[PDB]
Design a protein around this nucleic acid. Structure first.
Lengths: 56, 122, 114, 120, 209
RNA sequence: AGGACCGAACCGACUAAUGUCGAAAAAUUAGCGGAUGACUUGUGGCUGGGGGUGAAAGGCCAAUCAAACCGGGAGAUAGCU
RNA sequence: ACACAGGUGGUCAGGUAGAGAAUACCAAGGCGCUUGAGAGAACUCGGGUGAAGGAACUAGGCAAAAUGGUGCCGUAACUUC
RNA sequence: AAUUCCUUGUCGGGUAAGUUCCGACCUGCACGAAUGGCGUAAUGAUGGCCAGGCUGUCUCCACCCGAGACUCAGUGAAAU
RNA sequence: CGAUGUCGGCUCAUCACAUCCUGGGGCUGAAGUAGGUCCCAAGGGUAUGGCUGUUCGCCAUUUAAAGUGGUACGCGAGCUGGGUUUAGAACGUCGUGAGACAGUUCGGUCCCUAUCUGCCGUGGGCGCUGGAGAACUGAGGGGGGCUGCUCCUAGUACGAGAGGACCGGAGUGGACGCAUCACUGGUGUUCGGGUUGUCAUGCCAAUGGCACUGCCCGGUAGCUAAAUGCGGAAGAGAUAAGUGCUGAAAGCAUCUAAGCACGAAACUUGCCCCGAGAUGAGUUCUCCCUGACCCUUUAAGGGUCCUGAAGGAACGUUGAAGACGACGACGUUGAUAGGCCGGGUGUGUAAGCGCAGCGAUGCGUUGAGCUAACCGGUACUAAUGAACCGUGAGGCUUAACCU
């Protein structure tokens, strides 16, 4: 239950190949404030689908 | 669902009182025996006069079981005591005169016509 | 699923004399004696109803020769002829499985005149 | 192997789930809007809306029964007089969820859940 | 011959007026309609293509919407194929009904099974469980030894191990059909067929006789 | 009355499981034994290395014991690695 | 060795129920154990229930299950009574 | 026999079936009288065997509640 | 020897055939039956207990049979520790004594988070040469292959009888296997009820919290097995041992040398599942894009703007799909999820009141009230318009044909 030979920079680097991070690829803009929010999230200001629903 | 070491109540006036199954018959690696089946038993209790002694190995057939039979409609007849009769080891033709309690109708196997006859009910 | 219920109300028998658990009820059925056909009577106390439409069934406990016998009965079956209620019974539960251990005269239950 | 099961275990045993939902329902009744985790907020939505259904009838028993849940008279008094009969035209959805960002402490999917009026 | 695509509605019982209460399975087969007839001239084999059901027009796609508009049949969920037996000439657009089972006795249902997820070796392959006590230390359901020693030196391929159970296409043959009702387009077959109530399944007549 | 009885605090350590790069260089959980006596516990003293003490196992004597630990003979000697 | 499931002597010791300083729910008072959020696979740890059977398991009834109280009744061989 | 090698001795009992257990027989390899012989009430976390009771020990596992395992965010070893 | 853990047990195997059963034959001191012996055959199958640490054996009872062996006397980074194998203690015994005896008994710590191979699964990338969604092909590979019994033939053949068939057919089983939730059952800490103590909601009533779900009796859905369906084949091809026909060498004879006919669970298909990464990367259907422009050591060249479709992807509601990816359903033109609406189920007569009774408590309202995942309906809440990725007719040669 231990390694018998030290792996390399390749087998280290090749295992890390899928361990990279994705991208959001698209930031939906809202009607009123025109802010770039996440799709299906309220804005950081507070609007959502063109309405200050939160009244933050 | 009778099996090894199962304590049974005898269902005829033969001298037994309490018998233990030691082998189910008819097939290698065979598990449980139901109501139609023949099992080898022993004698754990006896009547003084009797026809059998304590510690006789002989053949039996389960006539009542707590697990119960299933009719062709799905209606299940469940009893309360796993009961059986005695059989003469060779060519069975049962040992006994009477039958106590009700037996079920699945004993119509043409060699248990005697056990049909001596039984009162069903 | 209407499709199953289509196939289920076309098959249930219609008489169905309704009762409750606790009742003493005499069920009559059809002992098919090969090519001959007689009728017997199973009479005891209903322990339980298993009421689900066509799939409904009910138990009955008959004491006979010190051997408690529990037969169930799929009600909508064409071997179960008729149901005749004999003694209306007063029970505060819908299942009566303590009848498997209480014996004798301390097993019999009350009347339900009401 | 979880086919057709409902409810969430929510990493809490049977008392704690029941006690929290008894507890968290009070604040949503009291404050008209609360900010929780989104997986909590969906299962909070299965509890308060039966209580608003109880507050669509002002019987003697429904006082007792909606007091038997949530154990609080002021929560019962918010129903049946203010929150209850006002909602009794729109039979159905009484609470609205909205997704918000991630909790700074441990990256949790925060969300609001709030009554569909919150009128002022 | 050919079989017929359908959908499982569940299981029911049927009482017959002599006694027995057979367990049946409800299969709503729709009007199955042929969309492509393949023949050995320019295809290498002869077979037919069949759709069934109904489909959302906003959820049918432009490569696939044209595939029905060249057949002239109405878009249904999914397509299937059937190997013909050299005496069954059809055409594209002939809606095959449930009248082909007017004298079929045992049909062979093929469908998918209910997925167990990651099964263990005791559920998936019926490995017997080790002893639950007499000192057995954190080993109550493990698969036990898997190989021999240095001389085969490796794990034989085909070893029954842990993994995925269910979610597999399965055929059950010789299942007796008891009702071929055509006004409701239903079919009642003895016993149980592959699971997932509501999922599609392919009925076919018996190869085995 | 009692090295008497059942049983907590208290003292012990039979069995099982866990744990075995541990929560821990000997524990936890569950059960188990004494439990007014040859009882247990605080405080302080006393007994030193071929010596002590030991209801005695070759046990204990600062996570060390068929002869402690520290420095010194001392870079012992090593037909062996 | 650590902000370590360990060790540590004395003192005060409330309400209900109970023989009780046990235990159970509370008081006074003090705390929620310095990572979280989901999912509800295998397999592991701690537990719950189980058809029919009832030690066949197994080195072995290991573990588990089971018994559990008070009051009266009744109680074997043997005995140093 | 805590002692008996041959030996699972032989007889009896217990089990359907008993290399262990109980009772005997002496053919004591190689018991034996304060390195004590032989008994013996009570005692024992003491060894051996049997019987009632109870049961997931097992026939043969099933489902369930939770703490891990798995996913994301944070921190972040190890033997080799 | 700077360590290969050493018996048996358990779990899991798997190969050989010198075959234990089933299959095929020849011989018989082979009448039948049942047997002996030899040849061919490895597809499948191939006991449970008692005693012992035992493998082994012995006994009991089955079975068609209870196969020999190889695999580190297979299997401890899988379990066990009873045996052998440390310290303690004792008997026999040998020794003056320390102690000693695969002589006896009693007791006596079993560590590892898996980098690589391997195997079980499950995906990401690229490829397959215009890009796209489907539906298949089948090279190749895997799974399955067991059999008892009664009955018909038939008391027929056979035989003095006693006994008792061959060949073919029917049915009901034992084991194993796949699937399934209708049935019968288990579970069901998300359903309803009973109840012990205590506490709290100001008090009564009525409730809740804690006590392993506090203890309990029931029990939807889902999930199960003991519940119920289903399988193993037929047939065809080529053969083994074998049996033959015709037939010379060798005027006869002769199953072989030419030629020809049968011949078994083994062999190849037939049954089931995977499968075009089968780089030999396959076929059919279908859908989508037909804008100009500069430059260059002018080459399948590179760059600039105008466009970005089929589609996919991402996000959201999500599922009998799931460890995570993945897979399916659905996104307002909507029933995917929740809520709701009526029902089903389960529990089994709520509360409040009235009446009766000294009271506990019983009656009537009332088969009430409450009901989880289920069934049928309803846009009430939630699934936003957009954005992102994927382009702009697709290499050279030759052939065959339209031009």
């Amino acid at each position: 239950a231990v390694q018998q030979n030290k792996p390399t920079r390749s087998k280290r680097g090749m295992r890390r190949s899928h361990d990279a991070l994705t991208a959001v690829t698209s930031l939906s803009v809202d009607k009123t404030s025109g802010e770039k929010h996440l799709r299906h999230h309220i804005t950081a200001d507070g609007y959502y689908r063109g309405r200050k629903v939160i009244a933050k | 669902m009778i099996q090894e070491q199962t304590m049974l109540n005898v269902a005829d006036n033969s001298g037994a009182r309490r018998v233990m199954c030691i082998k189910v018959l008819g097939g290698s690696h065979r598990r449980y025996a139901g109501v139609g089946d023949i099992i080898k038993i022993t004698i754990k209790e006896a009547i003084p006069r009797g026809k059998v002694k304590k510690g006789d190995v002989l053949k039996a057939v389960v006539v009542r079981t707590k697990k119960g039979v299933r009719r062709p409609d799905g209606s299940v007849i469940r009893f309360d005591g796993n009961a059986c009769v005695l059989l003469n080891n060779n060519s069975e033709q049962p040992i006994g005169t009477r039958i106590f309690g009700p037996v079920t109708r699945e004993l119509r196997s043409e060699k248990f016509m005697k056990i049909i006859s001596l039984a009162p009910e069903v | 699923s209407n499709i199953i219920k289509q196939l289920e109300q076309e098959q249930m028998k219609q008489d169905v004399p309704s009762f409750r658990p606790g009742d003493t009820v005499e069920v009559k059925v059809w002992v098919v004696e090969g090519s001959k056909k007689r009728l017997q009577a199973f009479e005891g106390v209903v322990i339980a109803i298993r009421n689900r439409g066509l799939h409904s069934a009910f138990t009955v406990r008959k004491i006979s020769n010190g051997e408690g016998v529990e037969r169930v009965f799929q009600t909508h079956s064409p071997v179960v002829d008729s149901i005749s209620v004999k003694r209306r019974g007063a029970v505060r539960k819908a299942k009566l499985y303590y009848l498997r251990e209480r014996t004798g005269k301390a097993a019999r239950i009350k009347e339900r005149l009401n | 192997m979880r086919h057709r099961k409902s409810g969430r275990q929510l990493n809490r045993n049977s008392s704690h789930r029941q006690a929290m939902f008894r507890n968290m329902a009070g604040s949503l009744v009291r404050h008209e809007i609360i900010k929780t985790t989104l997986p909590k907020a969906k299962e909070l939505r299965r509890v308060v809306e039966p209580l608003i259904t109880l507050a669509k009838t002002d019987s003697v028993a429904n006082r007792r029964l909606a007091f038997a849940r949530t154990r609080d008279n002021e929560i019962v008094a918010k129903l049946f007089n203010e929150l209850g009969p006002r909602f009794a035209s729109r039979a159905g959805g009484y609470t609205r969820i909205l997704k918000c960002g991630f909790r700074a402490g441990d990256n949790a999917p925060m969300a609001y859940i709030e009554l569909v009026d919150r009128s002022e | 011959m050919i079989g017929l695509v359908g959908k499982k509605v569940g299981m029911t019982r049927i009482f017959t007026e002599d006694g027995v209460s057979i367990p049946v399975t409800v299969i709503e087969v729709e009007a199955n309609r042929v969309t492509q007839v393949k023949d050995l001239a320019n295809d290498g084999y002869r077979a037919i293509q069949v759709t069934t059901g109904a489909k959302k027009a906003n959820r049918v796609t432009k490569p696939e919407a044209g595939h029905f508009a060249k057949a002239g049949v109405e878009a249904g969920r999914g397509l299937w194929e059937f190997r013909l037996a050299e005496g069954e000439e059809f055409t594209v657009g002939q809606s095959i009904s449930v009248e082909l089972f007017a004298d079929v006795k045992k049909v062979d249902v093929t469908g998918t099974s209910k997925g167990k997820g990651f099964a263990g070796t005791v559920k998936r392959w019926n490995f017997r469980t080790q002893d639950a006590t007499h000192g057995n230390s954190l080993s109550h359901r493990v698969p036990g030894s898997i190989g021999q020693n240095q001389t085969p030196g490796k794990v034989f391929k085909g070893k029954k191990m842990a993994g995925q159970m269910g979610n597999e296409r399965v055929t059950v043959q010789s299942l007796d059909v008891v009702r071929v009702d055509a006004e409701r387009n239903l079919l009642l077959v003895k016993g149980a067929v592959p699971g997932a109530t509501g999922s599609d399944l392919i009925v076919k007549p018996a190869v085995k006789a």
